[PDB]
UniProtKB/Swiss-Prot annotation:
It comes from Escherichia coli (strain K12). Sigma factors are initiation factors that promote the attachment of RNA polymerase to specific initiation sites and are then released. This sigma factor is the primary sigma factor during exponential growth. Preferentially transcribes genes associated with fast growth, such as ribosomal operons, other protein-synthesis related genes, rRNA- and tRNA-encoding genes and prfB. Coiled coil: none annotated. Contains 4 domains, connected by flexible linkers. In the active conformation, the domains are in an extended conformation, each making extensive interactions with the RNA polymerase catalytic core. It comes from the Bacteria. Belongs to the sigma-70 factor family. RpoD/SigA subfamily. Interacts transiently with the RNA polymerase catalytic core formed by RpoA, RpoB, RpoC and RpoZ (2 alpha, 1 beta, 1 beta' and 1 omega subunit) to form the RNA polymerase holoenzyme that can initiate transcription. Identified in a complex containing RpoD, the RNA polymerase subunits RpoA, RpoB and RpoZ, CRP and DNA. Interacts with Rsd; this prevents interaction with the RNA polymerase catalytic core and with promoter DNA, and as a consequence, promotes transcription from promoters that require alternative sigma factors. The gene is rpoD. This is RNA polymerase sigma factor RpoD.
Length: 79
DNA sequence: ACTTAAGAGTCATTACCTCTCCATAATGCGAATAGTGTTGCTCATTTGCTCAATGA
């Protein structure tokens, strides 16, 4: 299930490119979020995979670029 | 068994003066931990003051 939606990870992380982080770091952290979405996925709500996986991939990419992008790190609640 | 081509690597002066320019984006909600305030308390530091011998 994980190695069939990596194209979804590169499709999400295509837009977060020039935000202070490398392109390969983004899709790596998106893969971490994709694994966390695979482990907690429920099929009985009719949705296929993508509407549940997109939120977790976007969350992992945003929490990656909110912390590991600057030296003087501001937490996400303060920013 | 040896001889020309392709590709990679590594340098190309010294010293000083002036100026500009060096960033933008998800939300929220408990859990848990670090931080700050409170009160009672002890301990080290210094200083004016006191007490005891002693010769003139």
């Amino acid at each position: 299930m994980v190695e069939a939606n990596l194209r979804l990870v590169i499709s999400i992380a295509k837009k977060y490119t020039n935000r202070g982080l490398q392109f390969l770091d983004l899709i790596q952290e998106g893969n971490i979020g994709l694994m966390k979405a695979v482990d907690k996925f429920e099929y009985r709500r009719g949705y296929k995979f993508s509407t549940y996986a997109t939120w977790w991939i976007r969350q992992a990419i945003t929490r990656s670029i909110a912390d590991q992008a600057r030296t003087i790190r501001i937490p996400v609640h303060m920013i």
